[PDB]
Amino acid sequence: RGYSFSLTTFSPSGKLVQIEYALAAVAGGAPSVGIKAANGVVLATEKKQKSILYDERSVHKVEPITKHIGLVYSGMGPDYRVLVHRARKLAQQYYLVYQEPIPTAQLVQRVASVMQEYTQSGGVRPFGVSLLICGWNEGRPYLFQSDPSGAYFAWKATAMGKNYVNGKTFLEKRYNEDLELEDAIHTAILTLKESFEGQMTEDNIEVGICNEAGFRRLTPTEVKDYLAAI
């Protein structure tokens, strides 16, 4: 049982062939924006299903890691769910040994640590989910993104998934360092509104904020509320 040989390896050019394919599988994923704001963040994403047939209260893409840290993805479906499982477990190891909710930076350390050995270690392919992190952690909010390589960077705004160059350029245009509450939600909504493939339905987007009282998903009556206030 098992293989115990790495399938991720170095090209003759000198680069990882599987990781750039993982960033291709991320770049073919659903678009998701994340905006660091002066008191709190907003992590919006786009839930377009096949038909109007499914339960849009069944699966989530905003979902917390146990205290005040939500994380949203773009790319492969269930590999995300594995990273939520591992991330909740690592946050609870940290909580049972140090008796505080985990600093966001350390959670990104350990999630980027567990995503690294799937670029090695016996036949496993890398995850191909570049999920991004939020978190209030004391004083000022944080935001990160763990690539399927294992790198991570903190910033003020980003996008990912489909056509993310337009998201990074557009958020580079419209960002202010004091831009703080629901205005961030506003520009997040008009970053997903940029493509969306049509009509901007409230059941096809969900956002999550970290407004100094724990990460919480937004109820579907609140997104449609600001979709009435467009």
Partner: protein, 234 residues
Amino acid sequence: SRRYDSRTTIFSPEGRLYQVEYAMEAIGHAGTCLGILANDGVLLAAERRNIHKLLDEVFFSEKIYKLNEDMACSVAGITSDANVLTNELRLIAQRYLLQYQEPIPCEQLVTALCDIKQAYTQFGGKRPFGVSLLYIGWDKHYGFQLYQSDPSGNYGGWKATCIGNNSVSMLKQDYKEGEMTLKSALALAIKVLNKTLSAEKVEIATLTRENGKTVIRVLKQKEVEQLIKKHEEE
């Protein structure tokens, strides 16, 4: 199956290692951060990723990592691997303390990390750690010293060697081996980085001391705007 393995731990017919010198070409794609020692302490001088505004604050950067009170390390190549190994080697440092109550003279640490990284290129069938990271440090035995290692496994005392692209030959026409006077080592560092520049797109960090205990400074913002106007010509 034996049809599927990449077979990393195989000698070439020319005798070399295919997966090892592919890591050496991974350094030349992304890599900066020279290091200069003096009679006084040692400094790294580094480059960030690009001009992309969208970057709020790094406590330490993604380049310079603290290891003890008297050591630090900088990183080239693939940044996902080395993070792991630097936490790995950080463990090594602390357990030497647990075994000896000494602040781990840095050649012990570089030898240990190069032994485990050699162990990943020796067997196990995995890919080697694609990072030619280097180290600065001090011990009571020797002076201020920096070491430099690579994904092959060997290392050395490499008094002014840089890593990454555009390869150090100018430094081996400019470094005075006897005395260096660390302010002029900063001047030579911004010379080399000025040929290869405020702290939006540079990351320079020094190691000095006061009254015996070492001080690792990351050279906060306005010092870089001092040294960048310390030129006219160069």
